[PDB]
Amino acid sequence: VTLFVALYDYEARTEDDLSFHKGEKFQILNSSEGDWWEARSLTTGETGYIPSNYVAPV
């Protein structure tokens, strides 16, 4: 299981990443260090590349 939370908001400036507000949960599927993690939003259902440092394990 992987239920992280956005410690801060995020205005996806591109369609590649996602957008949300500090407090939104996310399901990390592919991290592997780096910088851009692919988490699926449990609200919309689609996934995107959100900032790995913008989310933490709950």
Curated annotation (Swiss-Prot):
Residues 1-58 form the SH3 domain. Isoform 1 is highly expressed in the brain. Isoform 2 is expressed in cells of hemopoietic lineages, especially T-lymphocytes. It is found in: Cytoplasm; Nucleus; Cell membrane; Perikaryon. Phosphorylated at tyrosine residues, which can be enhanced by NTN1. Palmitoylated. Belongs to the protein kinase superfamily. Tyr protein kinase family. SRC subfamily. Non-receptor tyrosine-protein kinase that plays a role in many biological processes including regulation of cell growth and survival, cell adhesion, integrin-mediated signaling, cytoskeletal remodeling, cell motility, immune response and axon guidance. Inactive FYN is phosphorylated on its C-terminal tail within the catalytic domain. Following activation by PKA, the protein subsequently associates with PTK2/FAK1, allowing PTK2/FAK1 phosphorylation, activation and targeting to focal adhesions. Interacts (via its SH3 domain) with PIK3R1 and PRMT8. Interacts with FYB1, PAG1, and SH2D1A. Interacts with CD79A (tyrosine-phosphorylated form); the interaction increases FYN activity. Interacts (via SH2 domain) with CSF1R (tyrosine phosphorylated). Interacts with TOM1L1 (phosphorylated form). Interacts with KDR (tyrosine phosphorylated). Interacts (via SH3 domain) with KLHL2 (via N-terminus). Interacts with SH2D1A and SLAMF1. Interacts with ITCH; the interaction phosphorylates ITCH and negatively regulates its activity. Interacts with FASLG. Interacts with RUNX3. Interacts with KIT. (Microbial infection) Interacts (via its SH3 domain) with hepatitis E virus/HEV protein ORF3. This is Tyrosine-protein kinase Fyn.
